Write an enzyme that holds these catalytic residues in place. Structure first.
Site, mmCIF file in Angstrom:
data_model
loop_
_atom_site.group_PDB
_atom_site.id
_atom_site.type_symbol
_atom_site.label_atom_id
_atom_site.label_comp_id
_atom_site.label_asym_id
_atom_site.label_seq_id
_atom_site.Cartn_x
_atom_site.Cartn_y
_atom_site.Cartn_z
ATOM 1 N N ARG B 89 44.752 28.770 43.370
ATOM 2 C CA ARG B 89 45.081 30.141 43.727
ATOM 3 C C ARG B 89 45.453 30.297 45.192
ATOM 4 O O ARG B 89 45.496 31.426 45.690
ATOM 5 C CB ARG B 89 43.907 31.059 43.385
ATOM 6 C CG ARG B 89 43.538 31.024 41.907
ATOM 7 C CD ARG B 89 42.304 31.861 41.597
ATOM 8 N NE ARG B 89 42.021 31.949 40.163
ATOM 9 C CZ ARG B 89 42.744 32.665 39.305
ATOM 10 N NH1 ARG B 89 43.803 33.348 39.729
ATOM 11 N NH2 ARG B 89 42.407 32.711 38.022
ATOM 12 N N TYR B 324 32.904 33.288 33.073
ATOM 13 C CA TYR B 324 32.991 31.846 32.852
ATOM 14 C C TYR B 324 31.631 31.226 32.525
ATOM 15 O O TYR B 324 30.586 31.678 32.999
ATOM 16 C CB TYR B 324 33.558 31.134 34.086
ATOM 17 C CG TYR B 324 34.928 31.591 34.541
ATOM 18 C CD1 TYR B 324 35.811 32.239 33.669
ATOM 19 C CD2 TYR B 324 35.340 31.367 35.852
ATOM 20 C CE1 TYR B 324 37.060 32.647 34.102
ATOM 21 C CE2 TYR B 324 36.574 31.772 36.291
ATOM 22 C CZ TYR B 324 37.436 32.406 35.420
ATOM 23 O OH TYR B 324 38.663 32.802 35.898
ATOM 24 N N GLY B 495 43.757 40.037 41.839
ATOM 25 C CA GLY B 495 42.534 40.166 42.615
ATOM 26 C C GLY B 495 41.982 38.840 43.130
ATOM 27 O O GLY B 495 41.466 38.777 44.249
ATOM 28 N N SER B 499 40.898 37.827 47.043
ATOM 29 C CA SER B 499 39.467 37.699 47.246
ATOM 30 C C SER B 499 39.113 36.343 47.876
ATOM 31 O O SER B 499 38.297 36.274 48.802
ATOM 32 C CB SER B 499 38.767 37.915 45.900
ATOM 33 O OG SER B 499 37.507 37.295 45.842
HETATM 34 C C1 LIG Z 1 36.035 32.440 45.759
HETATM 35 C C2 LIG Z 1 37.167 33.092 44.979
HETATM 36 C C3 LIG Z 1 37.524 32.170 43.802
HETATM 37 C C4 LIG Z 1 38.117 32.939 42.598
HETATM 38 C C5 LIG Z 1 37.172 32.928 41.399
HETATM 39 C C6 LIG Z 1 37.938 32.681 40.137
HETATM 40 C C7 LIG Z 1 38.322 33.675 39.326
HETATM 41 C C8 LIG Z 1 38.025 35.100 39.636
HETATM 42 C C9 LIG Z 1 37.354 35.749 38.478
HETATM 43 C C10 LIG Z 1 37.129 37.061 38.419
HETATM 44 C C11 LIG Z 1 37.546 38.017 39.491
HETATM 45 C C12 LIG Z 1 37.834 39.339 38.838
HETATM 46 C C13 LIG Z 1 38.578 40.274 39.422
HETATM 47 C C14 LIG Z 1 39.174 40.075 40.777
HETATM 48 C C15 LIG Z 1 39.285 41.386 41.460
HETATM 49 C C16 LIG Z 1 38.781 41.556 42.673
HETATM 50 C C17 LIG Z 1 38.101 40.438 43.393
HETATM 51 C C18 LIG Z 1 36.594 40.638 43.400
HETATM 52 C C19 LIG Z 1 35.931 39.697 44.417
HETATM 53 C C20 LIG Z 1 36.015 40.274 45.879
HETATM 54 O O1 LIG Z 1 35.766 41.482 46.033
HETATM 55 O O2 LIG Z 1 36.312 39.480 46.814
#
Ligand SMILES: CCCCC/C=C\C/C=C\C/C=C\C/C=C\CCCC(=O)O
Ligand code: COH
Ligand code: COH
Ligand SMILES: CCCCC/C=C\C/C=C\C/C=C\C/C=C\CCCC(=O)O
Ligand SMILES: CCCCCCCCO[C@@H]1O[C@H](CO)[C@@H](O)[C@H](O)[C@H]1O
Ligand SMILES: CC(=O)N[C@@H]1[C@@H](O)[C@H](O)[C@@H](CO)O[C@H]1O
Ligand SMILES: CC(=O)N[C@@H]1[C@@H](O)[C@H](O)[C@@H](CO)O[C@H]1O
Ligand SMILES: CC(=O)N[C@@H]1[C@@H](O)[C@H](O)[C@@H](CO)O[C@H]1O
Ligand SMILES: *[C@@H]1O[C@H](CO)[C@@H](O)[C@H](O)[C@H]1NC(C)=O
Ligand SMILES: *[C@@H]1O[C@H](CO)[C@@H](O)[C@H](O)[C@H]1NC(C)=O
Ligand SMILES: *[C@@H]1O[C@H](CO)[C@@H](O)[C@H](O)[C@H]1NC(C)=O
Ligand SMILES: *[C@@H]1O[C@H](CO)[C@@H](O)[C@H](O)[C@H]1NC(C)=O
Ligand SMILES: *[C@@H]1O[C@H](CO)[C@@H](O)[C@H](O)[C@H]1NC(C)=O
Lengths: 552, 551
Positions: B89, B324, B495, B499
């Site tokens: 990602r 997961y 997202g 993130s």
């Molecule tokens: C360390 C990041 C690695 C990614 C993890 C892998 C998959 C993500 C899985 C689910 C995330 C769901 C929605 C994402 C939306 C916003 C981010 C939330 C985390 C944050 O507010 O930051």
């Protein structure tokens, strides 16, 4: 009970931490060493330390074998491979994201996030240490006036054997004062250059309000005036841009440019005028390629092109000249695209300190048939108007600059500036010369005679400091034994080069998402960056296109 | 009009006008060439025939639990999968950042002005013939009709993944350190100049505010004690500005880093919990370093709490959201041999997708009481009446709402939801399908494909007429959810890259910072690497109640 890390016990970039009032621990993570002081080398480290050639051996190789270098310079595959080696070898040396500053000898969010500080390559000596350098030496360092007078002040002018001229000396001053902008209301460890790099705020202004007062708002251009048929920067009264001028300067001679202090020196106004013209020339070029663009996109794209032109010239003309190498350096961001590298920079205090090159300045400034003293030259832009830019370039290209290392060559006219470099180093609690040499992977000096390569100045220094391990960084850079027929000694090159790399290649325009033709308005604007030179900068913007160079 | 208004360049090519009615695409390093960067190179063809879809990868990560229980328990394997999770990602976010609301081309103003949110897609130019460029009608449908027809809650729809009110208030508390819109300037401007996880919502955005919140003894933050319990100090005692209605009693005007956290007692619950954690870590560092002064105790505690936040967000918060069976891991060393930029700039569209209003329940159920929105807002006497232990026990048990799947925004916050639509348009966002292509997803071919049902899709079709002009924010709330999940595909795939950059891009994850000595030695380093939402509550709340992000 003083701070237990005051003796700098941890070696090889290990980090020291107090564990009690009178005890310490060293953190050896990823140094390649272990043990109480990180002095025991790991197995691979032993092998790496037997194949590493010295900085002086590498310098020898690059400054000899010109016949072999002429071959290399004309094989592009070989040239990029060597330039890639040059760039990556000096990468591991700068902390990026940055760490310490004048108020924080440990990592903190305040030190990371407050952009008004210069960052620090070595943390300051703690406030309660028994001596100024830690534990070694006497309770007070020698009188800085005695240091200045005995080994720094110029007797007879010593010319630079590498042939640096006044185009070089004023380019150095003009270029570096976009990121060395000390905030003396706050202190010597603080800066007003919040971009921390090559953003060209010395042309466009540090804040948006200043930039808008400098802009014409037609065709992307900067405001200007015409005197005797020649284009110069506009006035303070016409722009309302604040500048520093003594009260006796006439209103028509109060030029307004991005950096508030550039009216002080006619050599700085020469380059301010050249770069203003270059901006408006690139606006003309971009308008012919994009008749559909408005003023804002023309202005912004011109600025990005000029940032690229600056980096190109600094690497391929300026550093090339300083280096003395037979190898032809190259500005090529693509060389880093498959390497680990952080596209960001924070200006280090010690980079500011080592760049105090005031032995460069001559005894008088020689323009045409005139020899101006310091008092006649300072704050007198009538000299620029009387002589013109063509005559400035022709005269400054011919006048030799002074040698920076090797001792006793600071002009007496700026003796108070040199004294302030010593005093503010101490005020900011710098560690010693030998601590900075180890920090950049150089052998510590064992004697003053080894430091200077002669006997007379070293004996003065020994009587003043008594221990080579308390010799200070900045006076050491100016008395150091120079490389053979060179302007600098080893410490200046090996400290200056990694700071300089990060400031040039760390610019966002060298990152993969920026380094594309469309960023600069297409292929025509891109080619302006990739063909730029100090000679072409002068030829395009100075009447008559006089020849120029950084060497006499 | 601008010749790039149809967004002709594909596969991350960059469009540039070359005349009044002509354009060129810059295909540099896209892996494609041709007039619109649509012709793939040979290697790109092979790369495209092995890439499995996000929905295939999601299926794999949420099945075969017997395999994941081996993976999760062999550290070499777990780190190998997490390293892939992180690097897959990475390539998606521009870093150093590029566009913003005022610049559809790269510029030094856009790079350097930290007061903007950055933009993952450039805005639609001002003179384009339709709001989305060239497609669709001359005006987008009325935002009130969109809101009413497909967004407003009819009956409360619970989240099938089991997210609770501990989760929902943690989401609000955490994200409002870096979503801090400067409404004096406009929706594209931010007041969070740190652009990330700096914990300014605890310590304050400015040094002047921080120093008013600090005790200046033992590294600690100021506090008060009411009925034997530690709460934040008052506005009158610290002189710290807060947003409170004029009728709030003096001792309920709590002062914390973020000026709006007095709005919701659920936000004050986390503000109190984190204040206690800072002062607890000061106690620990004082016994480890009796020689340290107040300034170093404060700064080292702040770095430790930043790491605790990142650890909890990855291994409890995102772990819960993901669904997961693989156990995600916070480990900065996984990137030390990878290409990665330790920096971040907050994107406008990240703010937009995070408007998870449907999480909010119809009432807030604490002990034997059921509070309405009107009773709950701005009323910290509820926190004092029940106490933190009862808050945790109640919020752990109350289910949150489903975010995707349509018709679940509570009517009490209908004006917030409307403003998300209206400000999207003010900021000239491109369409849902443009954002899907930007993040390597297949565009939707019909409204029925978007929602997975018939009634909402027909309403949307009559309103928008062309699926290629459907808007981003309403689409995320009506999208067909993953099976028994809280979100659909677009939310996860936009997202997750934003993130990642905000968590792993923090300076404390870089090699020169990620060392025991940065955190006061091994005792402080271990506080970060063993942190959990359960241990955060257990250490700071009387009785150590059990807690979790799921019911
Ligand atoms: C360390 C990041 C690695 C990614 C993890 C892998 C998959 C993500 C899985 C689910 C995330 C769901 C929605 C994402 C939306 C916003 C981010 C939330 C985390 C944050 O507010 O930051
Ligand atoms: C780069 C080479 C270079 C040149 C040619 C040069 C040329 C000249 C020059 C003749 C034209 C004069 C009269 C001066 C005089 C000064 N220089 Co320089 N300086 C140079 C490098 C510097 C640097 C580096 C600083 C520190 C800048 C700061 O932090 O803002 C500096 C700062 C100064 C200061 C203020 C700092 C202080 O004293 O504390 C004065 C005065 N000067 N300099
Ligand atoms: C993360 C989930 C989440 C939750 C549970 C939540 C819970 C609640 C809640 C329940 C007690 C109420 C009354 C509100 C009310 C508001 N929220 Co939220 N919000 C949430 C996410 C957001 C985001 C994201 C923003 C934009 C922040 C900004 O930029 O300042 C926001 C902004 C707001 C605004 C400002 C309007 C604007 O245009 O930004 C109000 C009012 N709200 N919110
Ligand atoms: C951004 C600042 C640029 C100005 C600094 C210039 C000089 C610093 C001092 C000494 C350097 C002298 C010679 C250069 C030596 C090697 C070239 C390294 C190439 C690079 O590192 O690219
Ligand atoms: C929650 C209050 C929203 C109703 C306000 C008027 C919007 C009318 O919207 C209609 O609502 C009907 C009832 O749900 C749906 O069946 C229709 O599909 C929808 O068009
Ligand atoms: C194992 C080892 O070499 N320990 C040395 C110690 O002898 C010396 O006194 C100290 C100086 O601070 O540095 C360390
Ligand atoms: C605040 C905002 O949105 N735009 C401002 C503008 O009002 C002001 O004239 C300019 C000068 O600094 O700075 C910007
Ligand atoms: C300018 C300086 O050196 N220190 C300042 C100090 O004057 C000010 O009180 C503090 C509060 O913001 O910010 C810092
Ligand atoms: C950032 O841009 C905004 C909008 O133009 C402007 O008001 C503000 O002054 C800029 N900030 C800086 C630091 O220039
Ligand atoms: C300023 O320079 C002019 C040259 O145009 C010279 O004639 C005049 O004497 C100088 N003024 C001072 C104070 O040196
Ligand atoms: C490129 O896309 C444009 C749509 O604007 C289309 O008209 C044109 O035919 C395309 N060119 C190619 C080579 O596909
Ligand atoms: C940075 O530090 C200086 C010195 O303490 C302080 O005065 C200034 O307010 C700080 N800057 C910020 C943005 O906090
Ligand atoms: C605030 O909460 C208290 C419960 O502690 C409740 O009794 C009171 O009625 C509430 N006030 C409002 C306006 O809801």
């Amino acid at each position: 009970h003083h701070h237990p890390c005051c003796s700098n016990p941890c070696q090889n970039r290990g980090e020291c931490m107090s564990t009690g009032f009178d005890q310490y621990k060293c953190d050896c993570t990823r140094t390649g060493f272990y043990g109480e002081n990180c002095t025991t080398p790991e197995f691979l480290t032993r092998i790496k330390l037997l194949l590493k050639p010295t900085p002086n051996t590498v310098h020898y190789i690059l400054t000899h074998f010109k016949g072999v270098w002429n071959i290399v310079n004309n094989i592009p595959f070989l040239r990029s491979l060597i330039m890639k080696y040059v760039l990556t070898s000096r990468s591991y040396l700068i902390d990026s994201p940055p760490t310490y500053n004048v108020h924080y000898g440990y990592k903190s969010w305040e030190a990371f996030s407050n952009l008004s500080y210069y960052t620090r390559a070595l943390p300051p000596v703690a406030d309660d240490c028994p001596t100024p350098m830690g534990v070694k030496g006497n309770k007070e360092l020698p009188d800085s006036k005695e240091v200045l007078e005995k080994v720094l002040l110029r007797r007879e002018f010593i010319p630079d054997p590498q042939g640096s001229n006044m185009m070089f000396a004023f380019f150095a001053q003009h270029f570096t004062h976009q990121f060395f902008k000390t905030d003396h209301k706050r202190g010597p460890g603080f800066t007003r250059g919040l971009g921390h790099g090559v953003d060209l705020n010395h042309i466009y202004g540090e804040t948006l309000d200043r930039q808008h007062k400098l802009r014409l708002f037609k065709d992307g251009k900067l405001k200007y005036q015409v005197i005797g048929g020649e284009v110069y920067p506009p006035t303070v009264k016409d722009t309302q841009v604040e500048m520093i001028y003594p009260p006796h300067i006439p209103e028509n001679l109060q030029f307004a440019v991005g950096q508030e202090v550039f009216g002080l020196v006619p050599g700085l106004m020469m380059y301010a005028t050249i770069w203003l013209r270059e901006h408006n020339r690139v606006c003309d070029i971009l308008k012919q390629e994009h008749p559909e663009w408005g003023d804002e996109q023309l202005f912004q794209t011109s600025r990005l092109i000029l940032i690229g032109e600056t980096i190109k010239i600094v690497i391929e003309d300026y550093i090339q000249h300083l280096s003395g190498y037979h190898f032809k350096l190259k500005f090529d961001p693509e060389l880093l695209f498959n390497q680990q590298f952080q596209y960001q920079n924070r200006i280090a205090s010690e980079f500011n300190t080592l760049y105090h090159w005031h032995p460069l300045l001559p005894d008088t400034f020689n323009i045409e048939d005139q020899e101006y003293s310091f008092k006649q030259f300072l704050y007198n832009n009538s000299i620029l108007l009387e002589h013109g830019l063509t005559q400035f370039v022709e005269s400054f290209t011919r006048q030799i600059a002074g040698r920076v290392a090797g001792g006793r060559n600071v002009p007496i006219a700026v003796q108070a500036v040199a004294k302030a470099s010593i005093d503010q180093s101490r005020e900011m609690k710098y560690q010693s010369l030998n601590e900075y040499r180890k920090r950049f992977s150089l052998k510590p000096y064992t004697s003053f005679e080894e430091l200077t390569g002669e006997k007379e100045m070293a004996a003065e220094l020994k009587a003043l400091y008594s221990d080579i391990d308390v010799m200070e960084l900045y006076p050491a850079l100016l008395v150091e034994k120079p490389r053979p027929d060179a302007i600098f000694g080893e410490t200046m090159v090996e400290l200056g080069a990694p700071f300089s790399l990060k400031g040039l290649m760390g610019n966002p325009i060298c990152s993969p998402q920026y380094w594309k033709p469309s960023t600069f308005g297409g292929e025509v604007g891109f080619k302006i960056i990739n063909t730029a030179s100090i000679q072409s900068l002068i030829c395009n913007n100075v009447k008559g296109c006089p020849f120029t160079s950084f060497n006499v």
